[PDB]
Amino acid sequence: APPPAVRAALADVPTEVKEKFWGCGNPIPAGIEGLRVLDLGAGSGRDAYVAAKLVGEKGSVTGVDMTPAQLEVAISHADAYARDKLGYGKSNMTFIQGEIEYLDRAGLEDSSFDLVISNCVINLSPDKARVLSEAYRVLAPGGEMHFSDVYVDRRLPQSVRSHPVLLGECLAGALYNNDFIRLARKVGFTDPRQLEAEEIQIHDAELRDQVGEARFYSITYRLFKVPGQIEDLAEDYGQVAVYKGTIPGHSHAYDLDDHHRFVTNKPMLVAGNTASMVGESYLAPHFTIIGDRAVHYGQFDASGPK
Ligand code: NA
């Protein structure tokens, strides 16, 4: 169950582009008309094709993949998709060959993307930290890394690590969610936000035994970049946010994350972080912020000392 816009856009993506994809989600955010999107690990192009639509004719998408076979599928269907299905003059997609760890080697410049998206390929990175820090480098201010991947509620035993088989799909090398958060924050994503999580029921029964009581999740994370603004606690500057109702397919309400649902025209008290995420990012044209950060009031939703 993807949002209607994503299902509508999927109906029209070349069967072959979809059949050849494999992923744990549909990580294209709402609100991206006219923006530039980088799709990490684009494979055969399902997610890039969907984005190419949702950003409109004036937005664009870049897909980076490791495998030439997968590339050539994304490339061969581009023009025809963009022309007949989207009715664009030409494809607004560019697929390039690369390693997600080395966006600099792929020629991707600082601040050249508004969104970085990914679908269940980061657990396979040999250098998670580099992919994260590269995402961070190629994002423009007020941009976001928005991506889905598989996590665990605890650290897997070393035993399970380097010798699983392939196991699960990449369930080996799925991190303890809080360890992921830590790594994101070392790189400058100070307050990752969980948009939604689904427990992945394991059901192999023989794998059950290998993992103990480990619980696995498919989580879509939101990693906003707002330099100088994003803090590691909810801090209280007395700001108020009002979602104006203008994000297509979200006229009644908008979920920033699973703890923050904004109802159209209903003001809500927010912390600095959240005010930055909805009002200083690419989402900002759809929100009003009342207040600012000239006066600090303390920690938000919590008393002072003890
Ligand atoms: Na709505």
PDB file of C-alpha atoms and ligand atoms in Angstrom:
ATOM      1  CA  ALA A   1       0.000   0.000   0.000  1.00  0.00           C
ATOM      2  CA  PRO A   2       1.942   3.002  -1.500  1.00  0.00           C
ATOM      3  CA  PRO A   3       0.294   6.496  -1.657  1.00  0.00           C
ATOM      4  CA  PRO A   4      -2.103   6.880  -4.745  1.00  0.00           C
ATOM      5  CA  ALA A   5       0.343   9.132  -6.717  1.00  0.00           C
ATOM      6  CA  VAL A   6       3.015   6.397  -6.472  1.00  0.00           C
ATOM      7  CA  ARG A   7       0.598   3.590  -7.524  1.00  0.00           C
ATOM      8  CA  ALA A   8      -0.683   5.786 -10.434  1.00  0.00           C
ATOM      9  CA  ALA A   9       2.934   6.447 -11.547  1.00  0.00           C
ATOM     10  CA  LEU A  10       3.843   2.719 -11.202  1.00  0.00           C
ATOM     11  CA  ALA A  11       0.949   1.618 -13.455  1.00  0.00           C
ATOM     12  CA  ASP A  12       2.767   3.340 -16.353  1.00  0.00           C
ATOM     13  CA  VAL A  13       6.388   2.240 -15.749  1.00  0.00           C
ATOM     14  CA  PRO A  14       7.641  -0.352 -18.299  1.00  0.00           C
ATOM     15  CA  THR A  15       6.951  -3.828 -16.946  1.00  0.00           C
ATOM     16  CA  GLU A  16      10.583  -4.805 -17.559  1.00  0.00           C
ATOM     17  CA  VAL A  17      11.835  -1.808 -15.618  1.00  0.00           C
ATOM     18  CA  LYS A  18       9.738  -3.041 -12.607  1.00  0.00           C
ATOM     19  CA  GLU A  19      10.113  -6.832 -12.921  1.00  0.00           C
ATOM     20  CA  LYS A  20      13.896  -6.338 -12.686  1.00  0.00           C
ATOM     21  CA  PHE A  21      13.974  -4.176  -9.556  1.00  0.00           C
ATOM     22  CA  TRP A  22      13.749  -5.767  -6.042  1.00  0.00           C
ATOM     23  CA  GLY A  23      13.382  -3.384  -3.089  1.00  0.00           C
ATOM     24  CA  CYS A  24      11.967  -2.906   0.393  1.00  0.00           C
ATOM     25  CA  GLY A  25       9.773   0.060  -0.311  1.00  0.00           C
ATOM     26  CA  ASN A  26       8.723   3.073  -2.292  1.00  0.00           C
ATOM     27  CA  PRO A  27      10.949   5.849  -0.904  1.00  0.00           C
ATOM     28  CA  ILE A  28       9.901   8.814  -3.159  1.00  0.00           C
ATOM     29  CA  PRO A  29       8.713  11.647  -0.896  1.00  0.00           C
ATOM     30  CA  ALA A  30       5.667  13.776  -1.651  1.00  0.00           C
ATOM     31  CA  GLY A  31       6.353  17.495  -2.296  1.00  0.00           C
ATOM     32  CA  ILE A  32       9.179  17.304  -4.864  1.00  0.00           C
ATOM     33  CA  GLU A  33       7.808  19.073  -7.937  1.00  0.00           C
ATOM     34  CA  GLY A  34      10.608  20.796  -9.859  1.00  0.00           C
ATOM     35  CA  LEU A  35      13.450  19.444  -7.723  1.00  0.00           C
ATOM     36  CA  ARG A  36      16.666  17.482  -8.485  1.00  0.00           C
ATOM     37  CA  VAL A  37      16.784  13.964  -7.192  1.00  0.00           C
ATOM     38  CA  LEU A  38      19.644  11.499  -6.874  1.00  0.00           C
ATOM     39  CA  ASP A  39      18.622   7.851  -6.773  1.00  0.00           C
ATOM     40  CA  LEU A  40      21.370   5.718  -5.230  1.00  0.00           C
ATOM     41  CA  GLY A  41      21.470   2.134  -6.608  1.00  0.00           C
ATOM     42  CA  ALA A  42      18.900   2.792  -9.253  1.00  0.00           C
ATOM     43  CA  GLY A  43      19.100  -0.760 -10.633  1.00  0.00           C
ATOM     44  CA  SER A  44      16.747  -1.125 -13.566  1.00  0.00           C
ATOM     45  CA  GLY A  45      15.113   2.233 -12.704  1.00  0.00           C
ATOM     46  CA  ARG A  46      11.696   1.611 -11.035  1.00  0.00           C
ATOM     47  CA  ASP A  47      12.252   4.330  -8.343  1.00  0.00           C
ATOM     48  CA  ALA A  48      13.931   6.769 -10.751  1.00  0.00           C
ATOM     49  CA  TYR A  49      11.011   6.380 -13.178  1.00  0.00           C
ATOM     50  CA  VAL A  50       8.561   7.104 -10.461  1.00  0.00           C
ATOM     51  CA  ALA A  51      10.540  10.127  -9.315  1.00  0.00           C
ATOM     52  CA  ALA A  52      10.988  11.367 -12.914  1.00  0.00           C
ATOM     53  CA  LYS A  53       7.209  11.617 -12.996  1.00  0.00           C
ATOM     54  CA  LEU A  54       6.622  13.102  -9.592  1.00  0.00           C
ATOM     55  CA  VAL A  55       9.146  15.865 -10.028  1.00  0.00           C
ATOM     56  CA  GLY A  56       7.446  17.024 -13.220  1.00  0.00           C
ATOM     57  CA  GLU A  57       9.002  18.101 -16.500  1.00  0.00           C
ATOM     58  CA  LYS A  58      11.080  20.795 -14.895  1.00  0.00           C
ATOM     59  CA  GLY A  59      12.581  18.573 -12.192  1.00  0.00           C
ATOM     60  CA  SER A  60      15.243  15.912 -12.862  1.00  0.00           C
ATOM     61  CA  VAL A  61      16.576  12.619 -11.725  1.00  0.00           C
ATOM     62  CA  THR A  62      19.999  11.097 -11.674  1.00  0.00           C
ATOM     63  CA  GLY A  63      20.421   7.325 -11.072  1.00  0.00           C
ATOM     64  CA  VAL A  64      23.736   5.740 -10.086  1.00  0.00           C
ATOM     65  CA  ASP A  65      24.226   2.015 -10.346  1.00  0.00           C
ATOM     66  CA  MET A  66      27.096  -0.426 -10.035  1.00  0.00           C
ATOM     67  CA  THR A  67      25.903  -2.911 -12.741  1.00  0.00           C
ATOM     68  CA  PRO A  68      25.973  -2.164 -16.612  1.00  0.00           C
ATOM     69  CA  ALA A  69      23.232  -4.770 -17.241  1.00  0.00           C
ATOM     70  CA  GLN A  70      20.886  -2.944 -14.839  1.00  0.00           C
ATOM     71  CA  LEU A  71      21.916   0.507 -16.258  1.00  0.00           C
ATOM     72  CA  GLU A  72      21.121  -0.386 -19.866  1.00  0.00           C
ATOM     73  CA  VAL A  73      17.574  -1.431 -18.901  1.00  0.00           C
ATOM     74  CA  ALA A  74      16.981   1.956 -17.201  1.00  0.00           C
ATOM     75  CA  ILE A  75      18.475   3.794 -20.220  1.00  0.00           C
ATOM     76  CA  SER A  76      16.724   1.878 -23.059  1.00  0.00           C
ATOM     77  CA  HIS A  77      13.270   2.591 -21.779  1.00  0.00           C
ATOM     78  CA  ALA A  78      13.773   6.211 -20.835  1.00  0.00           C
ATOM     79  CA  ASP A  79      12.749   8.234 -23.880  1.00  0.00           C
ATOM     80  CA  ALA A  80       9.671   6.268 -24.729  1.00  0.00           C
ATOM     81  CA  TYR A  81       8.466   6.412 -21.089  1.00  0.00           C
ATOM     82  CA  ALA A  82       9.012  10.131 -20.801  1.00  0.00           C
ATOM     83  CA  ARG A  83       7.441  10.853 -24.172  1.00  0.00           C
ATOM     84  CA  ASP A  84       4.328   8.590 -24.266  1.00  0.00           C
ATOM     85  CA  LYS A  85       3.652   8.020 -20.582  1.00  0.00           C
ATOM     86  CA  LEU A  86       4.603  11.326 -19.052  1.00  0.00           C
ATOM     87  CA  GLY A  87       4.029  13.457 -22.169  1.00  0.00           C
ATOM     88  CA  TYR A  88       7.387  15.263 -21.664  1.00  0.00           C
ATOM     89  CA  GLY A  89       9.370  16.712 -24.550  1.00  0.00           C
ATOM     90  CA  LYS A  90      12.312  14.498 -23.450  1.00  0.00           C
ATOM     91  CA  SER A  91      13.514  12.272 -20.549  1.00  0.00           C
ATOM     92  CA  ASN A  92      14.456  14.262 -17.446  1.00  0.00           C
ATOM     93  CA  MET A  93      16.583  11.170 -16.323  1.00  0.00           C
ATOM     94  CA  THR A  94      20.334  10.547 -16.442  1.00  0.00           C
ATOM     95  CA  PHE A  95      21.652   7.163 -15.468  1.00  0.00           C
ATOM     96  CA  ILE A  96      25.344   6.853 -14.744  1.00  0.00           C
ATOM     97  CA  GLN A  97      27.617   4.004 -13.790  1.00  0.00           C
ATOM     98  CA  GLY A  98      29.236   4.265 -10.390  1.00  0.00           C
ATOM     99  CA  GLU A  99      29.793   3.306  -6.849  1.00  0.00           C
ATOM    100  CA  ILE A 100      27.391   4.751  -4.340  1.00  0.00           C
ATOM    101  CA  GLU A 101      30.449   5.249  -2.020  1.00  0.00           C
ATOM    102  CA  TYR A 102      32.168   7.571  -4.530  1.00  0.00           C
ATOM    103  CA  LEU A 103      29.780  10.159  -5.822  1.00  0.00           C
ATOM    104  CA  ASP A 104      32.859  12.427  -6.320  1.00  0.00           C
ATOM    105  CA  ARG A 105      34.293   9.782  -8.702  1.00  0.00           C
ATOM    106  CA  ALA A 106      30.990   9.746 -10.517  1.00  0.00           C
ATOM    107  CA  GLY A 107      31.479  13.536 -11.029  1.00  0.00           C
ATOM    108  CA  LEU A 108      28.676  14.622  -8.621  1.00  0.00           C
ATOM    109  CA  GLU A 109      29.236  18.076  -7.261  1.00  0.00           C
ATOM    110  CA  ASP A 110      28.580  19.551  -3.810  1.00  0.00           C
ATOM    111  CA  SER A 111      25.056  20.855  -3.248  1.00  0.00           C
ATOM    112  CA  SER A 112      23.793  19.620  -6.596  1.00  0.00           C
ATOM    113  CA  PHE A 113      20.727  17.685  -5.409  1.00  0.00           C
ATOM    114  CA  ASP A 114      17.649  18.475  -3.395  1.00  0.00           C
ATOM    115  CA  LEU A 115      16.810  14.856  -2.491  1.00  0.00           C
ATOM    116  CA  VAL A 116      18.895  11.764  -2.242  1.00  0.00           C
ATOM    117  CA  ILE A 117      16.883   8.537  -2.298  1.00  0.00           C
ATOM    118  CA  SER A 118      17.716   4.848  -1.971  1.00  0.00           C
ATOM    119  CA  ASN A 119      15.958   1.553  -1.642  1.00  0.00           C
ATOM    120  CA  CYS A 120      17.546  -1.296   0.359  1.00  0.00           C
ATOM    121  CA  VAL A 121      21.047  -1.096  -1.022  1.00  0.00           C
ATOM    122  CA  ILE A 122      22.923   0.682   1.728  1.00  0.00           C
ATOM    123  CA  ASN A 123      23.323  -2.420   3.922  1.00  0.00           C
ATOM    124  CA  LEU A 124      25.426  -3.851   1.144  1.00  0.00           C
ATOM    125  CA  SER A 125      27.819  -0.973   1.061  1.00  0.00           C
ATOM    126  CA  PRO A 126      31.400  -1.853   2.108  1.00  0.00           C
ATOM    127  CA  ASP A 127      31.603   1.747   3.411  1.00  0.00           C
ATOM    128  CA  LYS A 128      28.243   2.943   4.787  1.00  0.00           C
ATOM    129  CA  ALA A 129      29.936   6.012   6.276  1.00  0.00           C
ATOM    130  CA  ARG A 130      31.157   7.145   2.869  1.00  0.00           C
ATOM    131  CA  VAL A 131      27.802   6.734   1.164  1.00  0.00           C
ATOM    132  CA  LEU A 132      26.222   8.742   3.992  1.00  0.00           C
ATOM    133  CA  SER A 133      28.858  11.463   3.915  1.00  0.00           C
ATOM    134  CA  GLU A 134      28.619  11.644   0.100  1.00  0.00           C
ATOM    135  CA  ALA A 135      24.799  12.004   0.265  1.00  0.00           C
ATOM    136  CA  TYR A 136      25.479  14.741   2.740  1.00  0.00           C
ATOM    137  CA  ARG A 137      28.015  16.444   0.403  1.00  0.00           C
ATOM    138  CA  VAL A 138      25.871  16.399  -2.744  1.00  0.00           C
ATOM    139  CA  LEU A 139      22.743  17.770  -0.906  1.00  0.00           C
ATOM    140  CA  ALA A 140      22.000  21.393  -1.151  1.00  0.00           C
ATOM    141  CA  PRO A 141      20.940  23.199   2.002  1.00  0.00           C
ATOM    142  CA  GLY A 142      17.346  22.400   3.022  1.00  0.00           C
ATOM    143  CA  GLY A 143      17.577  19.088   1.179  1.00  0.00           C
ATOM    144  CA  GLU A 144      16.922  15.638   2.417  1.00  0.00           C
ATOM    145  CA  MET A 145      18.173  12.067   2.184  1.00  0.00           C
ATOM    146  CA  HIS A 146      14.976  10.040   2.168  1.00  0.00           C
ATOM    147  CA  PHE A 147      15.491   6.263   1.933  1.00  0.00           C
ATOM    148  CA  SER A 148      14.297   2.850   3.049  1.00  0.00           C
ATOM    149  CA  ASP A 149      16.411   0.010   4.265  1.00  0.00           C
ATOM    150  CA  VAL A 150      16.383  -2.889   6.666  1.00  0.00           C
ATOM    151  CA  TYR A 151      17.421  -2.501  10.332  1.00  0.00           C
ATOM    152  CA  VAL A 152      17.463  -4.562  13.551  1.00  0.00           C
ATOM    153  CA  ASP A 153      16.274  -3.795  17.072  1.00  0.00           C
ATOM    154  CA  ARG A 154      19.632  -5.070  18.430  1.00  0.00           C
ATOM    155  CA  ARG A 155      23.217  -5.804  17.240  1.00  0.00           C
ATOM    156  CA  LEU A 156      23.587  -9.063  15.375  1.00  0.00           C
ATOM    157  CA  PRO A 157      26.171 -11.533  16.802  1.00  0.00           C
ATOM    158  CA  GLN A 158      29.563 -11.555  14.838  1.00  0.00           C
ATOM    159  CA  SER A 159      28.704 -15.183  14.130  1.00  0.00           C
ATOM    160  CA  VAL A 160      25.693 -14.066  12.022  1.00  0.00           C
ATOM    161  CA  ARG A 161      27.738 -11.189  10.446  1.00  0.00           C
ATOM    162  CA  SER A 162      30.405 -12.468   8.029  1.00  0.00           C
ATOM    163  CA  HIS A 163      28.838 -15.938   7.526  1.00  0.00           C
ATOM    164  CA  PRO A 164      25.038 -15.904   6.931  1.00  0.00           C
ATOM    165  CA  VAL A 165      25.022 -17.212   3.349  1.00  0.00           C
ATOM    166  CA  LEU A 166      23.333 -14.257   1.514  1.00  0.00           C
ATOM    167  CA  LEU A 167      20.586 -14.771   4.151  1.00  0.00           C
ATOM    168  CA  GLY A 168      17.330 -12.788   4.210  1.00  0.00           C
ATOM    169  CA  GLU A 169      18.373 -10.538   1.289  1.00  0.00           C
ATOM    170  CA  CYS A 170      21.004  -8.377   3.061  1.00  0.00           C
ATOM    171  CA  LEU A 171      19.607  -9.008   6.524  1.00  0.00           C
ATOM    172  CA  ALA A 172      23.205  -9.800   7.387  1.00  0.00           C
ATOM    173  CA  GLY A 173      24.834  -6.351   7.682  1.00  0.00           C
ATOM    174  CA  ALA A 174      21.494  -4.752   8.638  1.00  0.00           C
ATOM    175  CA  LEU A 175      22.516  -2.528  11.588  1.00  0.00           C
ATOM    176  CA  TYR A 176      21.050  -2.067  15.009  1.00  0.00           C
ATOM    177  CA  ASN A 177      18.866   0.951  14.265  1.00  0.00           C
ATOM    178  CA  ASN A 178      20.452   3.090  17.001  1.00  0.00           C
ATOM    179  CA  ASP A 179      23.929   2.361  15.602  1.00  0.00           C
ATOM    180  CA  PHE A 180      22.747   3.620  12.238  1.00  0.00           C
ATOM    181  CA  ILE A 181      21.454   6.793  13.855  1.00  0.00           C
ATOM    182  CA  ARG A 182      24.879   7.331  15.455  1.00  0.00           C
ATOM    183  CA  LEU A 183      26.711   6.946  12.112  1.00  0.00           C
ATOM    184  CA  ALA A 184      24.246   9.290  10.417  1.00  0.00           C
ATOM    185  CA  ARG A 185      24.882  11.821  13.064  1.00  0.00           C
ATOM    186  CA  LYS A 186      28.741  11.654  12.794  1.00  0.00           C
ATOM    187  CA  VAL A 187      28.384  12.621   9.190  1.00  0.00           C
ATOM    188  CA  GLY A 188      26.201  15.707   9.986  1.00  0.00           C
ATOM    189  CA  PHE A 189      22.626  14.251   9.917  1.00  0.00           C
ATOM    190  CA  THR A 190      22.047  15.202  13.526  1.00  0.00           C
ATOM    191  CA  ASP A 191      18.405  14.073  13.931  1.00  0.00           C
ATOM    192  CA  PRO A 192      17.287  11.232  11.727  1.00  0.00           C
ATOM    193  CA  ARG A 193      13.499  10.833  11.683  1.00  0.00           C
ATOM    194  CA  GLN A 194      11.656   7.640  11.135  1.00  0.00           C
ATOM    195  CA  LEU A 195       8.781   8.088   8.674  1.00  0.00           C
ATOM    196  CA  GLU A 196       7.500   4.516   8.949  1.00  0.00           C
ATOM    197  CA  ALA A 197       8.579   1.063  10.024  1.00  0.00           C
ATOM    198  CA  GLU A 198       7.262  -2.366   9.325  1.00  0.00           C
ATOM    199  CA  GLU A 199       8.456  -5.430  11.217  1.00  0.00           C
ATOM    200  CA  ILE A 200       9.697  -7.940   8.700  1.00  0.00           C
ATOM    201  CA  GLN A 201       8.338 -11.352   9.808  1.00  0.00           C
ATOM    202  CA  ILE A 202      11.153 -13.855   9.308  1.00  0.00           C
ATOM    203  CA  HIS A 203       9.177 -17.170   9.063  1.00  0.00           C
ATOM    204  CA  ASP A 204      12.204 -19.280   7.892  1.00  0.00           C
ATOM    205  CA  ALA A 205      12.097 -20.880  11.404  1.00  0.00           C
ATOM    206  CA  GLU A 206      15.593 -22.257  10.858  1.00  0.00           C
ATOM    207  CA  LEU A 207      16.924 -18.674  10.601  1.00  0.00           C
ATOM    208  CA  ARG A 208      14.922 -17.794  13.689  1.00  0.00           C
ATOM    209  CA  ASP A 209      17.386 -19.975  15.640  1.00  0.00           C
ATOM    210  CA  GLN A 210      20.452 -18.204  14.248  1.00  0.00           C
ATOM    211  CA  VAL A 211      19.307 -14.723  15.273  1.00  0.00           C
ATOM    212  CA  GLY A 212      17.982 -15.320  18.826  1.00  0.00           C
ATOM    213  CA  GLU A 213      15.245 -12.856  19.505  1.00  0.00           C
ATOM    214  CA  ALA A 214      16.465 -10.214  16.929  1.00  0.00           C
ATOM    215  CA  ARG A 215      13.625  -8.251  15.369  1.00  0.00           C
ATOM    216  CA  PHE A 216      14.025  -6.830  11.859  1.00  0.00           C
ATOM    217  CA  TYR A 217      12.445  -3.710  10.351  1.00  0.00           C
ATOM    218  CA  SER A 218      11.980  -2.053   7.046  1.00  0.00           C
ATOM    219  CA  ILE A 219      12.415   1.622   7.997  1.00  0.00           C
ATOM    220  CA  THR A 220      12.138   4.748   5.858  1.00  0.00           C
ATOM    221  CA  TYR A 221      14.315   7.433   7.315  1.00  0.00           C
ATOM    222  CA  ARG A 222      14.388  11.150   6.798  1.00  0.00           C
ATOM    223  CA  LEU A 223      17.773  12.831   6.915  1.00  0.00           C
ATOM    224  CA  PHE A 224      17.463  16.557   6.497  1.00  0.00           C
ATOM    225  CA  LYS A 225      20.264  18.879   5.862  1.00  0.00           C
ATOM    226  CA  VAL A 226      19.897  22.370   7.322  1.00  0.00           C
ATOM    227  CA  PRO A 227      23.404  23.512   8.101  1.00  0.00           C
ATOM    228  CA  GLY A 228      23.899  25.052  11.548  1.00  0.00           C
ATOM    229  CA  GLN A 229      20.296  24.275  12.618  1.00  0.00           C
ATOM    230  CA  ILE A 230      19.757  20.598  13.383  1.00  0.00           C
ATOM    231  CA  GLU A 231      20.496  19.759  17.097  1.00  0.00           C
ATOM    232  CA  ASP A 232      20.689  16.496  18.947  1.00  0.00           C
ATOM    233  CA  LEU A 233      17.768  17.281  21.203  1.00  0.00           C
ATOM    234  CA  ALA A 234      14.351  18.749  20.670  1.00  0.00           C
ATOM    235  CA  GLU A 235      15.095  22.355  21.760  1.00  0.00           C
ATOM    236  CA  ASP A 236      12.407  24.885  22.497  1.00  0.00           C
ATOM    237  CA  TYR A 237      12.430  28.205  20.655  1.00  0.00           C
ATOM    238  CA  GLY A 238       8.641  28.760  21.017  1.00  0.00           C
ATOM    239  CA  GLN A 239       7.959  28.281  17.324  1.00  0.00           C
ATOM    240  CA  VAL A 240       4.610  27.269  15.745  1.00  0.00           C
ATOM    241  CA  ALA A 241       4.121  25.425  12.428  1.00  0.00           C
ATOM    242  CA  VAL A 242       1.057  25.495  10.202  1.00  0.00           C
ATOM    243  CA  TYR A 243       0.773  23.220   7.329  1.00  0.00           C
ATOM    244  CA  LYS A 244      -1.025  25.070   4.560  1.00  0.00           C
ATOM    245  CA  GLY A 245      -2.518  22.024   2.814  1.00  0.00           C
ATOM    246  CA  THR A 246      -0.799  22.585  -0.494  1.00  0.00           C
ATOM    247  CA  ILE A 247       1.221  19.420  -0.978  1.00  0.00           C
ATOM    248  CA  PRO A 248      -0.485  17.489  -3.790  1.00  0.00           C
ATOM    249  CA  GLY A 249      -2.211  14.337  -2.513  1.00  0.00           C
ATOM    250  CA  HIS A 250      -2.032  15.806   1.030  1.00  0.00           C
ATOM    251  CA  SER A 251      -4.663  18.555   1.233  1.00  0.00           C
ATOM    252  CA  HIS A 252      -5.992  17.487   4.730  1.00  0.00           C
ATOM    253  CA  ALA A 253      -2.876  16.483   6.530  1.00  0.00           C
ATOM    254  CA  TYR A 254       0.850  15.868   6.117  1.00  0.00           C
ATOM    255  CA  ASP A 255       3.114  13.428   7.981  1.00  0.00           C
ATOM    256  CA  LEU A 256       6.601  14.806   8.499  1.00  0.00           C
ATOM    257  CA  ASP A 257       7.467  11.626  10.428  1.00  0.00           C
ATOM    258  CA  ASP A 258       5.705   9.065  12.574  1.00  0.00           C
ATOM    259  CA  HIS A 259       5.548  11.505  15.605  1.00  0.00           C
ATOM    260  CA  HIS A 260       4.506  14.612  13.687  1.00  0.00           C
ATOM    261  CA  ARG A 261       1.279  14.792  11.760  1.00  0.00           C
ATOM    262  CA  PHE A 262       0.191  18.280  10.691  1.00  0.00           C
ATOM    263  CA  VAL A 263      -3.386  18.932  10.007  1.00  0.00           C
ATOM    264  CA  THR A 264      -4.143  21.587   7.393  1.00  0.00           C
ATOM    265  CA  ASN A 265      -4.327  25.053   8.964  1.00  0.00           C
ATOM    266  CA  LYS A 266      -4.074  23.717  12.498  1.00  0.00           C
ATOM    267  CA  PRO A 267      -1.170  25.346  14.270  1.00  0.00           C
ATOM    268  CA  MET A 268       1.175  23.149  16.347  1.00  0.00           C
ATOM    269  CA  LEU A 269       3.990  23.881  18.821  1.00  0.00           C
ATOM    270  CA  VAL A 270       7.266  22.534  17.520  1.00  0.00           C
ATOM    271  CA  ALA A 271      10.913  22.178  18.404  1.00  0.00           C
ATOM    272  CA  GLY A 272      13.769  23.974  16.398  1.00  0.00           C
ATOM    273  CA  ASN A 273      14.439  20.809  14.465  1.00  0.00           C
ATOM    274  CA  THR A 274      10.980  20.157  13.295  1.00  0.00           C
ATOM    275  CA  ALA A 275      10.518  23.908  12.503  1.00  0.00           C
ATOM    276  CA  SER A 276      13.674  23.656  10.331  1.00  0.00           C
ATOM    277  CA  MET A 277      12.533  20.478   8.636  1.00  0.00           C
ATOM    278  CA  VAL A 278       9.145  21.797   7.474  1.00  0.00           C
ATOM    279  CA  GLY A 279       9.951  25.453   7.290  1.00  0.00           C
ATOM    280  CA  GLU A 280      13.600  25.865   6.152  1.00  0.00           C
ATOM    281  CA  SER A 281      13.774  22.916   3.812  1.00  0.00           C
ATOM    282  CA  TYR A 282      12.349  22.251   0.353  1.00  0.00           C
ATOM    283  CA  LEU A 283       9.011  21.676   2.041  1.00  0.00           C
ATOM    284  CA  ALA A 284       8.894  25.238   3.312  1.00  0.00           C
ATOM    285  CA  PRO A 285       6.588  26.863   0.716  1.00  0.00           C
ATOM    286  CA  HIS A 286       3.802  24.654   2.215  1.00  0.00           C
ATOM    287  CA  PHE A 287       4.296  25.717   5.860  1.00  0.00           C
ATOM    288  CA  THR A 288       4.142  28.869   7.947  1.00  0.00           C
ATOM    289  CA  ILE A 289       6.444  29.205  10.901  1.00  0.00           C
ATOM    290  CA  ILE A 290       5.547  31.639  13.551  1.00  0.00           C
ATOM    291  CA  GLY A 291       8.383  32.724  15.755  1.00  0.00           C
ATOM    292  CA  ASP A 292      12.098  32.314  15.347  1.00  0.00           C
ATOM    293  CA  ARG A 293      15.208  31.273  17.276  1.00  0.00           C
ATOM    294  CA  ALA A 294      16.125  34.594  18.994  1.00  0.00           C
ATOM    295  CA  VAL A 295      15.121  33.262  22.368  1.00  0.00           C
ATOM    296  CA  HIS A 296      15.768  29.835  23.734  1.00  0.00           C
ATOM    297  CA  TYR A 297      13.301  28.435  26.255  1.00  0.00           C
ATOM    298  CA  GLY A 298      14.765  25.144  27.257  1.00  0.00           C
ATOM    299  CA  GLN A 299      14.359  21.649  26.218  1.00  0.00           C
ATOM    300  CA  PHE A 300      11.093  21.098  24.298  1.00  0.00           C
ATOM    301  CA  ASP A 301       8.526  18.800  26.001  1.00  0.00           C
ATOM    302  CA  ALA A 302      10.542  18.200  29.146  1.00  0.00           C
ATOM    303  CA  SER A 303      11.179  20.088  32.393  1.00  0.00           C
ATOM    304  CA  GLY A 304      14.586  21.546  33.422  1.00  0.00           C
ATOM    305  CA  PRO A 305      17.198  19.524  35.506  1.00  0.00           C
ATOM    306  CA  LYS A 306      15.646  16.425  37.313  1.00  0.00           C
TER     307      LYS A 306
HETATM  308 NA    NA B   1      -4.546  14.263   2.953  1.00  0.00          NA
END
